Design a protein around this ligand. Sequence first.
Ligand SMILES: [K+]
Ligand SMILES: [K+]
Ligand SMILES: [K+]
Ligand SMILES: [K+]
Ligand SMILES: [K+]
Lengths: 327, 327, 327, 327
Amino acid sequence: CRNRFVKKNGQCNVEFTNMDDKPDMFTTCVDIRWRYMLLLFSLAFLVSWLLFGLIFWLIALIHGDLENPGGDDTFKPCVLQVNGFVAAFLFSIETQTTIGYGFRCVTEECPLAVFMVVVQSIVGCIIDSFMIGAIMAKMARPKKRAQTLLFSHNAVVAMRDGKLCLMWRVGNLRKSHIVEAHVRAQLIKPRITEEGEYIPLDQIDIDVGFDKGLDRIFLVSPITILHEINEDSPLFGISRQDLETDDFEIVVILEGMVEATAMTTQARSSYLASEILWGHRFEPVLFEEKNQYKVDYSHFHKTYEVPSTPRCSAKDLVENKFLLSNS
Amino acid sequence: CRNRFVKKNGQCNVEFTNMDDKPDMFTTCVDIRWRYMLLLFSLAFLVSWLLFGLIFWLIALIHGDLENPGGDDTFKPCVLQVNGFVAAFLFSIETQTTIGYGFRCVTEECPLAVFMVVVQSIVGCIIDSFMIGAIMAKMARPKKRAQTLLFSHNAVVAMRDGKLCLMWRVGNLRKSHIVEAHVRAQLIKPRITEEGEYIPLDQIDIDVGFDKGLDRIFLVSPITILHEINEDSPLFGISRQDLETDDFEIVVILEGMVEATAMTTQARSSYLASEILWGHRFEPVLFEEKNQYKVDYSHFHKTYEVPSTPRCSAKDLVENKFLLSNS
Amino acid sequence: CRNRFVKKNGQCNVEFTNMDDKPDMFTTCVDIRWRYMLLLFSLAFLVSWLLFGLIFWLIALIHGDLENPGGDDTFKPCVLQVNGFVAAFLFSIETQTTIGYGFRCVTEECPLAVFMVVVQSIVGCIIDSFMIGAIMAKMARPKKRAQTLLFSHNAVVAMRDGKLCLMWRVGNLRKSHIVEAHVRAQLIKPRITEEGEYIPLDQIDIDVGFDKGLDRIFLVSPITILHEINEDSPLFGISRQDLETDDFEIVVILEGMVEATAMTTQARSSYLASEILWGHRFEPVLFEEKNQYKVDYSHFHKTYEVPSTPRCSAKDLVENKFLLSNS
Amino acid sequence: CRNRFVKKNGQCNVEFTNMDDKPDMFTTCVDIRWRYMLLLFSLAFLVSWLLFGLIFWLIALIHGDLENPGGDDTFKPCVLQVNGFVAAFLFSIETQTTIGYGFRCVTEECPLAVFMVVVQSIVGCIIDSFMIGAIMAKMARPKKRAQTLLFSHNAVVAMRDGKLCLMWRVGNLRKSHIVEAHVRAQLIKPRITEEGEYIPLDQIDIDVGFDKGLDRIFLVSPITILHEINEDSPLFGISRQDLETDDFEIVVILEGMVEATAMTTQARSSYLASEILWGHRFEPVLFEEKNQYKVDYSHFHKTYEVPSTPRCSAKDLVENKFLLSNS
Ligand SMILES: [K+]
Ligand SMILES: [K+]
Ligand SMILES: [K+]
Ligand SMILES: [K+]
Ligand SMILES: [K+]
């Protein structure tokens, strides 16, 4: 009903505007796209090859080498066979790439031309080294790492061991593991405090076992996360009828160090009130066979009805028992 | 008796099937094997060397260079000494590798041939830089890092300071340390909830001191991890006789940042009910000598009997004391 | 009034003096500046090019090559066309850069000159590889990573849900996320213990929800951090009048793994007593539009008065209620 | 009196013996020393240069090139100017280094020689790329990172705010910070359990505030860590007289992500019973000046006597107060 803060794929639906502007290289490197970075580097080569080509051409002109490029017994050029700009350009390329076919070749005659080969060589090494580093930076820090973690499409409400629970499923799409993996959840909705303060989107924890460490999971086969709805839950007063009427969002988070990518990851998804299925339970995916366990991921998102599920809130379930005792 | 979820070496015994298919480069790089990646790169060289060889050969043909490859006073080729495809191929290799022996050598005559050396040079740099990056990616992120952490073959049950305890041993195989190292444990077995829900493999925490921080260890010499079996333990009602009858698995985990590999690691092992030795204790490994401590790792896995160990459950041990008090 | 320990931008205002001096390469590499490192490497090239140039020149001299550099039917030089130091220098450059124009060229004659090309080649590879590594080290580990996290200029005191609270705002300047993000706060001031010990700057925790996990945040749009001022707070006895009189500093911290830079970050700021605005509340920044949320960052630092805010301390607010009950 | 488990500099004093032997490349790379790795790579160059030199020499021999190395109108060699092994060797070096002076130069004649240049080029790229990677691996993961964290030489016992405390000092030797920094401590000594089990070195936590988060520190200027000695402390029954008699070791740990090195670090030190100074307090190091704070690190390790410090244990201090109340 209201706008969705976090999309089902984890993407946050929030635009930032009217920010402040401040006056690093590593961040700049990984942002720019491939085709743009490769054009940039090929530009850096052209510019250096033209710059030095022009300088060697000038040196040829002033020395009189364009009139006698091969030299003779009386005359030795600065750089053999520089007879024009194209030849000067070729010698620059040949020097910096270090192809050096050698028909065009520097001589001992001109200390400036010697100096210029010394400088071009060093500039060449620098440009190359930066290209290798920029390529590794972008190679090592991509921005489209395909998600390795999966949330179910729906959450459910149902009874487990005498308690009304909100439940969602998480699974790992690879055979590699998640180290120090742990889960969180939040109820997102606006509210006004008793002092009349408006909070556009207040985020209220959904307890999944933090205080006894049980928020920490060892995720091999898909696990079902449990939030007991009790006094302290923000869903304590919500019945099945309140659900289809209500307008709120539950954000769910899984965090951990993913072996596959060697980086700490935050996977996300969202459940609107209208995506929570009261009186449902998830289809098992894990089955034992021969000498090995197996997970059929088709049943990952699938649920089934439990009609014996109470339709009243957890508060009502509690307050019924205290009355069914007095009289 | 039932299938083993996690093998003694940490390997999880679970196959994934019937997954969903989605439409990164860094993950692709580290997966592919050495011999396959090196063939792939040598293929990328061949392809680029043949591509450009063919292009330079075409340019020679159309220019009439194959009939006069050395040139003369009236005729200058695009690229000296390209007299066939093999020569064209050699010039391509020489240019991109930047060997450039120079017998075959580009001239000033043909702006397209000049352009093609410019392009081949840049393509060469790109291919090389990618090869360096791909080699480092795979070098820095291997998938056969020999385990540096060791679990004992067996767990044991025995008394320590008046309490019946489940115990397993962990040790570090190197002189380098594990930063922020800490342990976990779980009882793995299927169960049906009171509402008739089947959980194929429910994972139930085994308390090793999380709530007072004592799950955190400083692991120099092998340490023995302790799980007090009390009210809250899932082994509270299990006696020595129940053990040899029962069918369950205890997964044990050690996590931390390993100095040796500079990465957060999750070491794993498993104990089936039949691998837990009731009434046993581990052989010490740590002995003081001269001015230095020493660990003999032969006694790591070794145990010895304690016949004074009660054979009844922890519940029975408790319920006996309350009765031996009333009368 | 007293000196500020931590500046508003996070910078700590503390100088270290009279330290102890101890007798790594990776830290040395990232510290040195760009222009200084590039001069250092260009120096390393010059030195190696001159060293070997000199060695090849010596070999030429002793062999008699300077008198017959081209050689003939009876005489073969160690290295063709080394007719002086400049030629020797050029051959050294050409060999190590591997330009190798080849007019100057090593021969089969002198095993020492052959040995020296072998050594120079290897030295060349080593120098190059170090340059690539040093450039990546500095590229990957910069010291001017523009802050991606923002604190408000002021903290405020105001009522929320019946409780007097210290509040500051934190926001994320990028669309990328912060993994395992969490907050801390501290009151910094000197004190003397009852035993007469002076602590120049004692750091006293400001509780922002650590014991129930609520110090952990999922930071998409700017969040307001809450410190309930109660019995256990160090601001329990401080009223609005005490604030404008008092002299203390509150340091605020946000920590987490920042996706943008792939590194664990500690963002910092500070609030002097005189920067805390009693009886104020922050301007909302988050507004719903069309099918998307939006953050206007101009209102980030902006506040508004709440005159219904009590001006007495939290202790006074408490002690009033116990009296307004007895009589 | 007994052997010291952890040295004052953090080094653990434990040898491992009689370990099990198992049948990665990245770990192998960072272990080997510089001079040994550089010899290894220079060996890899020699071997490849000799291998291919020999192959090109064979090709010359069988083709009859050693009798006519320059060729003529009727005869074209496989590789020009290969007149012996030294020339063959030179051509191999020139090809793989890609110096390619070009006097020695491959021709179009022999498909095997062409094939061999193709193979040598690729082998060259591979060897080079591995050298760059191995150099970065060792560059990025050194084993002599100079410690950036300092512990005091002594711990002390003294009163703070009505409580008998064990105290040690920690300081940061750089202006860069430690992210998510936190402390631990342990009492190390052997003991026998009531069931007669010997634990060579039992490690018993020393509480420094874990349960309220106060083990976490923001370390700018040197901080003094506090362990309140109470009921739950293992130093509860230890008086000043017991200290000079006792034989135990307290290990102290500081962990966190160090900005300077971009890695999670564990700093260590130790205090033997004989290094704990009862009735002492640390010299302040932090002083306010002008508009800036300053730390004089000379007073870091320095202490001063407090003769008003009780000489009895914390148990005695407690049990005195309950008696001084009854009568
Ligand atoms: K070359
Ligand atoms: K050449
Ligand atoms: K080259
Ligand atoms: K060349
Ligand atoms: K040449």
